[PDB]
Design a protein around this ligand. Structure first.
Ligand code: VHY
Length: 501
């Protein structure tokens, strides 16, 4: 079974980060999209899960995701590995962890558990590692004595604004849930205006790849607990820091296959974990582009740092995913552009790839969060543009820079671009009155290969992770369950750019 899209991505990653293969990125065969029997598309865990229901009575997607998290942890024989943006998991998310651990201990196991969050410098952490550990111990009750906890909050770079943004739940190195959902009450659990998000569940060797990736983050975290400005660490039962928990669990034999799905795991190390991939020959033609009305003051790691690429293969992974599309690409995001300053407004190479596809007649669709979404720096569902023209107009100038003339750029822009903000029903806003917020980090290409993960397409220099799947059957489930319903309702919020019929 051919995988032309995974092949193009694999070439990009091996030229970018050959040294990081097997830790920060890895291609595997034999994975299974982990759907419960009777629900073939249940591996796709969308939230809140109320397509075409403006009042969203039944938050059935959020209940399936928590149910799935609880069940995967309950099955744990050996290791539980959790990462997210701060805060530590609370609400139903903590209940899922606590309930799962009690069940695993009750089945006679003594699981080791890593819970890592990334914290921004300006962010104040109400519940710190030691307090969170203590809450866990208390709710676990008698079971705590059999549970080895490592809990840690971390920040890799104050100046380059870098900390963990990956959203992972890996159990025994063989099941993995990942995506864009924060294990964080307020965003998804207790509001009549809940953010729209998506996760996926798999099993197989690509779960071990996620495990390896978290070992990389914990090697750094354990070592840099020597600097409490960077790492806060708490363990239970006198346990040591466990930097290589996933490698110890893997052992010598290679991961066993669970199905037939080929997957590329790929993350990135942000800034301040590893300066560069010492074995990488990557030497790119970095784009000479200016920006209309923003210049980043910080050093532009997205658009002008070779070394950053070599330790962040996810950014080239996403670009070569779009580059790989022969027919059509769907981009469903919270944002394509970033707030500038502090970060660059956009990823030049990404917009050049998109423009190149518009000029080749490849259909491009961009659905982002509504610009009416104002939030704080990390609100989730917030928008970082004031208008959708800040995407189309950028696509235009990058088209003119390529095609030569503006007329040719209009036949490309108006002919091949669909640009909208997110809706999940016929209502323009929630029946709550507040607007729809989108939190996807999703790219789909030719209904064959897709990315689901935590890594946004807008510039951020955080540590992220995600999976690229190539499977015509799985992209078809993705199209039916998410992409078609998304466009069915977000086209009522479509943009028609400047200079177009
Ligand atoms: C600031 C540059 C990194 C960034 O942009 O951070 C976005 C992230 C949320 O990202 P997202 O989930 O909305 O895509 O917020 C945070 O990590 C900071 C919260 C205090």
């Amino acid at each position: 079974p051919p995988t032309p899209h995974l092949d193009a991505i694999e070439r990009s990653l091996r030229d970018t980060s050959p040294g990081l293969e097997g830790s920060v990125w890895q291609r595997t065969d034999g994975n299974r999209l982990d759907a419960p029997d009777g629900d073939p598309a249940g591996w796709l865990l969308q939230t809140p899960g109320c397509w075409g229901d403006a009042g969203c009575k039944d938050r059935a997607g959020t209940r399936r995701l928590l149910d799935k998290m609880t069940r995967n942890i309950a099955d744990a024989r050996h290791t539980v590995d959790i990462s997210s943006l701060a805060p530590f998991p609370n609400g139903g998310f903590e209940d899922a962890v606590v309930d799962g651990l009690k069940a695993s201990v009750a089945a006679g196991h003594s699981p080791r558990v890593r819970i890592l969050v990334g914290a921004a410098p300006i962010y104040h952490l109400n519940v710190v590692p030691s307090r969170y550990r203590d809450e866990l111990i208390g709710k676990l009750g008698a079971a705590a004595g059999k549970v080895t906890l490592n809990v840690a909050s971390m920040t890799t770079s104050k100046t380059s604004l870098s900390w963990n943004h990956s959203k992972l739940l890996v159990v025994d190195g063989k099941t993995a849930i990942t995506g864009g959902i924060n294990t964080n009450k307020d965003d998804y659990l207790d509001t009549a205006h809940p953010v729209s998000d998506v996760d996926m569940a798999l099993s197989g060797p690509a779960a071990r790849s996620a495990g390896k990736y978290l070992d990389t983050l914990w090697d750094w975290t354990c070592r840099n607990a020597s600097d409490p400005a960077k790492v806060w660490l708490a363990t239970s039962n006198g346990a040591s820091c466990m930097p290589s928990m996933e490698q110890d669990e893997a052992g010598s034999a290679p991961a066993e296959p669970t199905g037939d799905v080929p997957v590329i795991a790929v993350g990135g190390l942000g800034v301040g974990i590893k300066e560069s991939d010492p074995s990488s020959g990557y030497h790119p033609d970095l784009p000479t582009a200016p920006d209309t009305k923003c210049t980043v003051g910080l050093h532009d790691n997205t658009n002008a740092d070779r070394d950053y690429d070599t330790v962040n293969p996810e950014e080239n992974a996403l670009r070569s995913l779009i580059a790989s599309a022969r027919s059509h690409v769907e981009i469903s995001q919270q944002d394509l552009n970033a707030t500038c300053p502090p970060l660059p407004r956009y990823d030049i190479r990404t917009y050049d790839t998109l423009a190149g596809k518009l000029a080749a007649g490849v259909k491009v669709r961009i659905v982002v969060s509504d610009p009416a979404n104002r939030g704080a720096v990390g609100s989730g569902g917030r928008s970082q543009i004031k208008s959708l023209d800040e995407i189309s107009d950028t696509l235009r100038t990058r088209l003119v820079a390529l095609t030569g003339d503006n007329e040719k750029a209009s036949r490309a822009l108006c002919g091949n671009l669909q640009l909208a903000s997110f809706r999940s029903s016929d209502a323009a806003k929630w029946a709550d009155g507040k607007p729809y917020a989108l939190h996807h980090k999703l790219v789909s290409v030719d209904d064959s290969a897709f990315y689901i993960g935590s890594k946004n397409l807008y510039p951020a220099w955080l540590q992220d992770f995600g999976y690229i799947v190539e499977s015509p059957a799985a992209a078809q489930q993705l199209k039916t369950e998410l992409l078609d319903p998304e466009w069915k309702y977000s086209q009522q919020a479509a943009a028609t750019p400047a200079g177009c019929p």
